[PDB]
């Protein structure tokens, strides 16, 4: 009937949904007013919390708050990747006939879900948010996936959509969606090379696309599976723990809720630092009855992650090399991921590309969703 098709960025740490309507794309904000919602699902005695409500209680419910499902989806339990990651997740992953599965306690009873089931919960929240905005039912959808996702991971993502009551029109690659967002898919009678630099919450991807006469071709990809904004937050944490230890003589490492409450403050300050040069850290009763009041400068923040930010260029060089291109041969540089909002990273990348201008007018964390929405409208036949 009507039901606008939506574009959904099913992210590792955050997801985003947008619709194309009347020539323009609108990225839908949630009930809390955020344009992206955490890819978190929590289980308690009384309820199943999803998104912001879920993430905002993780310090209390470590064992029953699920995240990083995108790292599990489509894989086997005996998968080396699963085995490694598994070691640092506060929730349990079990082996159900070769398939990895998350084990959580809900309403007193022990329950387990397949990665696909967790993702469908997040997708339900996105569809929900979309519907709340559109004031109409949403069925059709285009969901995005990393270019390196194999048939299994891709099917598992389609499955997650089906479970959530979404008719997935197509599963397109994330880098391809970011290009479409900026319109780099328009035919110009020439072959164009685009570099997608994607730095999100916990994954770093770099892909070189070649678009000719309308068709995309992934030339090369590179990055680091365990490099993201969360790593930057941690450096700040260690910094403040040592600060507190020095100024109060009490190490707070031991207290897991104090540490996580600090981390939450650091993530927020980090965001403020992308627009301001100083940020306040106000934490009442951080350890025992000690309030932790301090501040940090962008200069110090950059100091804390120097090597990290700098190392970002290594995967870029490799990408160029594998694609068999020189810096000069790349036509467009698109910034994707919430972490690309950091000034220093934008500087460092530009300097590397000898001054070339960065594509970044569309919020990097909303770019993929933006492109998916455009593509959804096309597939639905309304654009
Ligand atoms: N203003 C900002 N400065 C730095 N990092 C930011 C900013 N806004 C968002 N982020 C970070 O971006 C990450 C979210 O990236 P996003 O693409 O939304 O997630 P993902 O792709 O991992 O699902 C988090 O680390 C968040 O702190
Ligand atoms: Mg992202």
From Swiss-Prot:
Interaction with BAG1: region residues: 185-376
Topology of this chain in the membrane: Peripheral membrane protein
Post-translational modification: Acetylated. ISGylated.
Positions where Phosphoserine occurs in the chain: 152, 328, 361
Reactions catalysed according to its record: ATP + H2O = ADP + phosphate + H(+)
Coiled-coil stretches: none
Modification sites for N-acetylserine: 1
Nucleotide-binding domain (NBD): annotated span: 1-383
Disulfide bonds: none
Tissue expression summary: Ubiquitous.
GO CC annotations, alphabetized: cytoplasm; cytosol; lysosomal membrane; melanosome; nucleolus; nucleus; plasma membrane; presynapse
GO MF annotation terms: ATP binding; ATP hydrolysis activity; ATP-dependent protein folding chaperone; heat shock protein binding; protein folding chaperone; protein-macromolecule adaptor activity
Sequence positions that bind ADP: 13-14, 201, 267, 270, 274, 338
Main location group: cytoplasm
Induction (free text): Constitutively synthesized.
Enzyme category, top tier: hydrolase
E.C. number: 3.6.4.10
Modified residues (N6-acetyllysine): 107, 245, 318, 327
Quaternary organization: Component of the chaperone-assisted selective autophagy (CASA) complex consisting of BAG3, HSPA8/HSC70, HSPB8 and STUB1/CHIP. Identified in a IGF2BP1-dependent mRNP granule complex containing untranslated mRNAs. Interacts with PACRG. Interacts with HSPH1/HSP105. Interacts with IRAK1BP1 and BAG1. Interacts with DNAJC7. Interacts with DNAJB12 (via J domain). Interacts with DNAJB14 (via J domain). Interacts (via C-terminus) with the E3 ligase STUB1 forming a 210 kDa complex of one STUB1 and two HSPA8 molecules.
Job description of the protein: Molecular chaperone implicated in a wide variety of cellular processes, including protection of the proteome from stress, folding and transport of newly synthesized polypeptides, chaperone-mediated autophagy, activation of proteolysis of misfolded proteins, formation and dissociation of protein complexes, and antigen presentation. Plays a pivotal role in the protein quality control system, ensuring the correct folding of proteins, the re-folding of misfolded proteins and controlling the targeting of proteins for subsequent degradation.
Protein name, UniProt field: Heat shock cognate 71 kDa protein
Organism for this UniProt entry: Bos taurus
